[PDB]
Protein backbone atom coordinates (compact mmCIF):
# COMPACT_ATOMS: atom_id res chain seq x y z
CA UNK A 1 0.00 0.00 0.00
CA UNK A 2 1.47 3.36 -1.09
CA UNK A 3 0.37 6.56 0.64
CA UNK A 4 -1.92 4.92 3.20
CA UNK A 5 -2.18 4.59 6.97
CA UNK A 6 -1.51 1.76 9.44
CA UNK A 7 -4.79 -0.15 10.00
CA UNK A 8 -6.19 -0.18 13.53
CA UNK A 9 -4.95 -3.65 14.64
CA UNK A 10 -7.49 -6.43 13.93
CA UNK A 11 -10.04 -3.91 12.55
CA UNK A 12 -10.34 -5.93 9.29
CA UNK A 13 -10.79 -9.43 10.76
CA UNK A 14 -11.43 -11.15 7.39
CA UNK A 15 -7.91 -10.23 6.09
CA UNK A 16 -5.71 -13.17 5.06
CA UNK A 17 -1.92 -13.23 4.63
CA UNK A 18 -0.83 -15.83 2.05
CA UNK A 19 2.62 -17.43 1.69
CA UNK A 20 2.91 -19.01 -1.77
CA UNK A 21 5.35 -21.81 -2.46
CA UNK A 22 6.75 -22.84 -5.83
CA UNK A 23 9.26 -25.60 -6.60
CA UNK A 24 12.00 -23.36 -8.13
CA UNK A 25 12.06 -20.08 -6.20
CA UNK A 26 11.59 -18.76 -2.62
CA UNK A 27 8.22 -17.87 -1.06
CA UNK A 28 6.07 -15.12 -2.56
CA UNK A 29 3.24 -13.35 -0.72
CA UNK A 30 -0.32 -12.17 -1.38
CA UNK A 31 -3.36 -10.94 0.47
CA UNK A 32 -6.82 -12.49 0.48
CA UNK A 33 -10.03 -12.43 2.53
CA UNK A 34 -12.08 -14.99 4.44
CA UNK A 35 -15.57 -15.31 2.91
CA UNK A 36 -16.55 -18.56 4.68
CA UNK A 37 -14.94 -20.21 7.72
CA UNK A 38 -13.09 -22.56 5.28
CA UNK A 39 -12.78 -20.39 2.13
CA UNK A 40 -10.45 -17.50 1.23
CA UNK A 41 -10.89 -15.43 -1.94
CA UNK A 42 -7.76 -14.06 -3.68
CA UNK A 43 -6.16 -13.56 -7.14
CA UNK A 44 -5.49 -16.48 -9.53
CA UNK A 45 -1.93 -15.19 -10.12
CA UNK A 46 -1.31 -16.08 -6.42
CA UNK A 47 -1.63 -19.84 -7.19
CA UNK A 48 1.31 -22.08 -6.35
CA UNK A 49 2.35 -25.62 -5.50
CA UNK A 50 1.21 -25.03 -1.92
CA UNK A 51 -0.16 -22.09 0.08
CA UNK A 52 -0.32 -21.22 3.78
CA UNK A 53 -2.91 -18.80 5.20
CA UNK A 54 -2.44 -16.69 8.34
CA UNK A 55 -5.60 -15.14 9.82
CA UNK A 56 -5.71 -12.73 12.75
CA UNK A 57 -2.52 -10.81 11.89
CA UNK A 58 -1.53 -7.19 12.25
CA UNK A 59 2.27 -7.14 12.51
CA UNK A 60 3.16 -10.25 10.50
CA UNK A 61 6.66 -10.41 12.13
CA UNK A 62 5.32 -10.88 15.69
CA UNK A 63 3.45 -14.10 16.54
CA UNK A 64 0.47 -13.56 18.87
CA UNK A 65 -2.54 -15.47 20.20
CA UNK A 66 -4.87 -14.01 17.52
CA UNK A 67 -2.87 -15.82 14.79
CA UNK A 68 -4.46 -18.82 13.11
CA UNK A 69 -2.06 -20.52 10.67
CA UNK A 70 -4.23 -22.65 8.42
CA UNK A 71 -3.49 -25.30 5.79
CA UNK A 72 -4.98 -25.04 2.29
CA UNK A 73 -6.28 -28.39 0.95
CA UNK A 74 -7.25 -27.30 -2.56
CA UNK A 75 -6.91 -24.32 -4.92
CA UNK A 76 -9.77 -23.38 -7.27
CA UNK A 77 -8.34 -21.08 -9.96
CA UNK A 78 -10.90 -19.57 -12.36
CA UNK A 79 -11.00 -22.02 -15.32
CA UNK A 80 -10.70 -19.17 -17.87
CA UNK A 81 -7.77 -17.40 -16.12
CA UNK A 82 -5.34 -16.20 -18.81
CA UNK A 83 -1.68 -15.61 -17.86
CA UNK A 84 -1.16 -13.28 -20.88
CA UNK A 85 -4.18 -10.94 -20.58
CA UNK A 86 -4.72 -11.56 -16.84
CA UNK A 87 -8.48 -11.83 -17.49
CA UNK A 88 -10.42 -13.68 -14.78
CA UNK A 89 -7.76 -13.14 -12.10
CA UNK A 90 -9.69 -14.80 -9.26
CA UNK A 91 -9.20 -17.91 -7.08
CA UNK A 92 -10.83 -19.63 -4.11
CA UNK A 93 -8.78 -21.46 -1.46
CA UNK A 94 -10.44 -24.19 0.57
CA UNK A 95 -8.98 -24.53 4.05
CA UNK A 96 -8.37 -27.92 5.64
CA UNK A 97 -10.46 -26.94 8.68
CA UNK A 98 -12.90 -24.15 9.47
CA UNK A 99 -11.26 -21.14 11.12
CA UNK A 100 -12.16 -20.23 14.69
CA UNK A 101 -14.33 -17.14 15.11
CA UNK A 102 -12.70 -14.54 17.41
CA UNK A 103 -12.72 -10.76 17.73
CA UNK A 104 -9.69 -10.76 15.38
CA UNK A 105 -10.97 -13.39 12.88
CA UNK A 106 -14.32 -13.36 11.10
CA UNK A 107 -15.88 -13.81 7.66
CA UNK A 108 -16.96 -11.20 5.12
CA UNK A 109 -19.85 -12.91 3.22
CA UNK A 110 -21.33 -11.20 0.18
CA UNK A 111 -24.76 -9.50 0.45
CA UNK A 112 -27.49 -10.85 -1.85
CA UNK A 113 -27.22 -7.83 -4.21
CA UNK A 114 -24.61 -8.02 -7.00
CA UNK A 115 -25.18 -4.62 -8.63
CA UNK A 116 -22.57 -3.23 -11.05
CA UNK A 117 -20.51 -0.52 -9.34
CA UNK A 118 -20.05 2.55 -11.57
CA UNK A 119 -17.13 5.00 -11.48
CA UNK A 120 -17.03 7.90 -9.05
CA UNK A 121 -17.03 6.75 -5.41
CA UNK A 122 -14.24 6.20 -2.86
CA UNK A 123 -13.36 2.68 -1.68
CA UNK A 124 -10.67 1.29 0.66
CA UNK A 125 -8.02 -1.42 0.11
CA UNK A 126 -5.71 -3.05 2.71
CA UNK A 127 -2.51 -5.10 2.49
CA UNK A 128 1.01 -5.88 3.69
CA UNK A 129 2.59 -4.95 0.35
CA UNK A 130 5.38 -2.54 -0.54
CA UNK A 131 4.98 1.10 0.50
CA UNK A 132 6.93 2.34 -2.53
CA UNK A 133 8.91 1.15 -5.57
CA UNK A 134 12.17 0.74 -3.67
CA UNK A 135 10.56 -0.19 -0.32
CA UNK A 136 10.07 -3.63 1.19
CA UNK A 137 6.71 -5.08 2.18
CA UNK A 138 5.10 -3.54 5.29
CA UNK A 139 5.39 -5.49 8.54
CA UNK A 140 1.99 -3.99 9.61
CA UNK A 141 -1.34 -4.08 7.78
CA UNK A 142 -1.81 -0.80 5.86
CA UNK A 143 -4.88 0.71 4.15
CA UNK A 144 -5.71 3.53 1.73
CA UNK A 145 -8.85 5.24 0.36
CA UNK A 146 -8.89 5.31 -3.48
CA UNK A 147 -11.12 6.76 -6.20
CA UNK A 148 -12.92 4.47 -8.63
CA UNK A 149 -12.05 5.93 -12.03
CA UNK A 150 -13.83 5.97 -15.35
CA UNK A 151 -12.54 3.03 -17.49
CA UNK A 152 -10.74 5.34 -19.96
CA UNK A 153 -8.26 6.07 -17.14
CA UNK A 154 -7.03 2.44 -17.51
CA UNK A 155 -6.93 2.39 -21.36
CA UNK A 156 -3.11 2.17 -21.39
CA UNK A 157 -3.50 -1.33 -19.94
CA UNK A 158 -4.33 -2.69 -23.37
CA UNK A 159 -6.04 -5.84 -21.99
CA UNK A 160 -8.16 -3.94 -19.43
CA UNK A 161 -11.92 -4.37 -19.80
CA UNK A 162 -14.58 -2.33 -17.98
CA UNK A 163 -17.02 -5.28 -17.73
CA UNK A 164 -14.43 -7.48 -16.02
CA UNK A 165 -12.35 -5.06 -13.95
CA UNK A 166 -12.37 -1.90 -11.86
CA UNK A 167 -9.99 1.01 -12.53
CA UNK A 168 -8.71 2.20 -9.16
CA UNK A 169 -6.71 5.25 -8.03
CA UNK A 170 -6.66 8.90 -9.16
CA UNK A 171 -3.53 9.32 -11.36
CA UNK A 172 -2.89 12.75 -9.76
CA UNK A 173 -2.05 11.12 -6.39
CA UNK A 174 0.55 8.54 -5.29
CA UNK A 175 -2.02 6.56 -3.26
CA UNK A 176 -2.33 3.00 -4.61
CA UNK A 177 -2.37 -0.72 -4.06
CA UNK A 178 1.00 -2.15 -5.14
CA UNK A 179 3.21 -5.24 -5.23
CA UNK A 180 2.52 -7.50 -2.26
CA UNK A 181 -1.12 -6.31 -2.05
CA UNK A 182 -2.24 -8.83 -4.75
CA UNK A 183 -5.46 -10.66 -3.88
CA UNK A 184 -6.60 -8.22 -1.17
CA UNK A 185 -10.18 -6.83 -1.16
CA UNK A 186 -11.39 -3.42 -2.24
CA UNK A 187 -14.30 -2.49 0.05
CA UNK A 188 -16.89 0.12 -0.99
CA UNK A 189 -19.20 1.09 1.92
CA UNK A 190 -18.12 -2.07 3.74
CA UNK A 191 -18.85 -4.43 0.79
CA UNK A 192 -16.08 -6.22 -1.15
CA UNK A 193 -16.30 -5.10 -4.80
CA UNK A 194 -12.77 -5.67 -6.13
CA UNK A 195 -9.61 -7.84 -5.83
CA UNK A 196 -6.12 -6.30 -6.33
CA UNK A 197 -4.83 -7.70 -9.68
CA UNK A 198 -2.05 -5.70 -11.38
CA UNK A 199 -0.67 -2.31 -12.39
CA UNK A 200 2.51 -0.49 -13.40
CA UNK A 201 5.98 -1.47 -12.12
CA UNK A 202 6.63 2.24 -11.40
CA UNK A 203 3.53 2.43 -9.14
CA UNK A 204 1.79 5.24 -11.09
CA UNK A 205 -1.94 4.77 -10.52
CA UNK A 206 -4.51 3.70 -11.54
CA UNK A 207 -4.27 -0.05 -10.87
CA UNK A 208 -6.51 -2.86 -12.14
CA UNK A 209 -8.80 -4.83 -9.82
CA UNK A 210 -10.97 -7.87 -10.59
CA UNK A 211 -14.64 -6.78 -10.62
CA UNK A 212 -16.27 -9.17 -8.14
CA UNK A 213 -19.88 -8.66 -9.34
CA UNK A 214 -18.99 -10.35 -12.65
CA UNK A 215 -17.75 -13.52 -10.85
CA UNK A 216 -20.56 -13.90 -8.28
CA UNK A 217 -22.14 -16.88 -10.18
CA UNK A 218 -18.80 -18.71 -10.33
CA UNK A 219 -18.05 -18.01 -6.63
CA UNK A 220 -21.49 -19.35 -5.70
CA UNK A 221 -20.98 -22.49 -7.84
CA UNK A 222 -17.68 -23.37 -6.15
CA UNK A 223 -19.00 -22.66 -2.61
CA UNK A 224 -22.17 -24.73 -3.13
CA UNK A 225 -20.27 -27.78 -4.56
CA UNK A 226 -17.41 -27.88 -2.03
C1 LIG B 1 2.59 -14.32 -6.52
N1 LIG B 1 3.07 -12.98 -6.84
C2 LIG B 1 2.80 -11.97 -5.85
C3 LIG B 1 3.71 -12.73 -7.99
O1 LIG B 1 3.92 -13.60 -8.80
C4 LIG B 1 4.15 -11.31 -8.24
C5 LIG B 1 3.01 -10.44 -8.71
C6 LIG B 1 2.56 -9.30 -8.13
C7 LIG B 1 3.02 -8.70 -6.88
O2 LIG B 1 4.20 -8.62 -6.61
O3 LIG B 1 2.08 -8.41 -6.03
N2 LIG B 1 1.48 -8.80 -8.86
C8 LIG B 1 0.76 -7.56 -8.63
C9 LIG B 1 1.45 -6.35 -9.23
C10 LIG B 1 2.58 -6.51 -10.02
C11 LIG B 1 3.22 -5.41 -10.60
C12 LIG B 1 2.75 -4.15 -10.40
C13 LIG B 1 1.58 -3.92 -9.64
C14 LIG B 1 1.07 -2.62 -9.42
C15 LIG B 1 -0.07 -2.44 -8.69
C16 LIG B 1 -0.73 -3.52 -8.11
C17 LIG B 1 -0.25 -4.79 -8.28
C18 LIG B 1 0.91 -5.04 -9.04
C19 LIG B 1 1.30 -9.61 -9.97
C20 LIG B 1 0.36 -9.53 -11.00
C21 LIG B 1 0.35 -10.51 -11.98
C22 LIG B 1 1.28 -11.54 -11.90
F1 LIG B 1 1.29 -12.49 -12.89
C23 LIG B 1 2.22 -11.64 -10.90
C24 LIG B 1 2.23 -10.66 -9.90
ZN1 LIG C 1 -3.03 -8.38 18.34
From Swiss-Prot:
<feature type="active site" description="Charge relay system">
    <location>
        <position position="89"/>
    </location>
</feature>
<dbReference type="GO" id="GO:0042277">
    <property type="term" value="F:peptide binding"/>
</dbReference>
<feature type="domain" description="Peptidase S1">
    <location>
        <begin position="1"/>
        <end position="224"/>
    </location>
</feature>
<dbReference type="GO" id="GO:0030901">
    <property type="term" value="P:midbrain development"/>
</dbReference>
<dbReference type="GO" id="GO:0004252">
    <property type="term" value="F:serine-type endopeptidase activity"/>
</dbReference>
<feature type="glycosylation site" description="N-linked (GlcNAc...) asparagine">
    <location>
        <position position="59"/>
    </location>
</feature>
<feature type="disulfide bond">
    <location>
        <begin position="123"/>
        <end position="188"/>
    </location>
</feature>
<feature type="disulfide bond">
    <location>
        <begin position="154"/>
        <end position="167"/>
    </location>
</feature>
<keyword id="KW-0645">Protease</keyword>
<dbReference type="GO" id="GO:0036464">
    <property type="term" value="C:cytoplasmic ribonucleoprotein granule"/>
</dbReference>
<dbReference type="GO" id="GO:0071333">
    <property type="term" value="P:cellular response to glucose stimulus"/>
</dbReference>
<dbReference type="GO" id="GO:0002003">
    <property type="term" value="P:angiotensin maturation"/>
</dbReference>
<dbReference type="GO" id="GO:0030163">
    <property type="term" value="P:protein catabolic process"/>
</dbReference>
<feature type="disulfide bond">
    <location>
        <begin position="30"/>
        <end position="46"/>
    </location>
</feature>
<dbReference type="GO" id="GO:0005576">
    <property type="term" value="C:extracellular region"/>
</dbReference>
<comment type="function">
    <text>Major secreted protease of mast cells with suspected roles in vasoactive peptide generation, extracellular matrix degradation, and regulation of gland secretion.</text>
</comment>
<dbReference type="GO" id="GO:0008236">
    <property type="term" value="F:serine-type peptidase activity"/>
</dbReference>
<dbReference type="InterPro" id="IPR009003">
    <property type="entry name" value="Peptidase_S1_PA"/>
</dbReference>
<keyword id="KW-0732">Signal</keyword>
<dbReference type="InterPro" id="IPR001254">
    <property type="entry name" value="Trypsin_dom"/>
</dbReference>
<dbReference type="GO" id="GO:0005829">
    <property type="term" value="C:cytosol"/>
</dbReference>
<keyword id="KW-0378">Hydrolase</keyword>
<dbReference type="InterPro" id="IPR018114">
    <property type="entry name" value="TRYPSIN_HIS"/>
</dbReference>
<dbReference type="GO" id="GO:0050727">
    <property type="term" value="P:regulation of inflammatory response"/>
</dbReference>
<feature type="glycosylation site" description="N-linked (GlcNAc...) asparagine">
    <location>
        <position position="82"/>
    </location>
</feature>
<keyword id="KW-1015">Disulfide bond</keyword>
<dbReference type="GO" id="GO:0030141">
    <property type="term" value="C:secretory granule"/>
</dbReference>
<dbReference type="GO" id="GO:0004175">
    <property type="term" value="F:endopeptidase activity"/>
</dbReference>
<feature type="active site" description="Charge relay system">
    <location>
        <position position="45"/>
    </location>
</feature>
<dbReference type="GO" id="GO:0140447">
    <property type="term" value="P:cytokine precursor processing"/>
</dbReference>
<feature type="active site" description="Charge relay system">
    <location>
        <position position="182"/>
    </location>
</feature>
<keyword id="KW-0720">Serine protease</keyword>
<dbReference type="GO" id="GO:0051604">
    <property type="term" value="P:protein maturation"/>
</dbReference>
<dbReference type="GO" id="GO:0006518">
    <property type="term" value="P:peptide metabolic process"/>
</dbReference>
<dbReference type="GO" id="GO:0022617">
    <property type="term" value="P:extracellular matrix disassembly"/>
</dbReference>
<dbReference type="GO" id="GO:0045766">
    <property type="term" value="P:positive regulation of angiogenesis"/>
</dbReference>
<dbReference type="GO" id="GO:0034769">
    <property type="term" value="P:basement membrane disassembly"/>
</dbReference>
<dbReference type="GO" id="GO:0005615">
    <property type="term" value="C:extracellular space"/>
</dbReference>
<dbReference type="Pfam" id="PF00089">
    <property type="entry name" value="Trypsin"/>
</dbReference>
<dbReference type="GO" id="GO:0062023">
    <property type="term" value="C:collagen-containing extracellular matrix"/>
</dbReference>
<keyword id="KW-0964">Secreted</keyword>
<comment type="similarity">
    <text>Belongs to the peptidase S1 family. Granzyme subfamily.</text>
</comment>
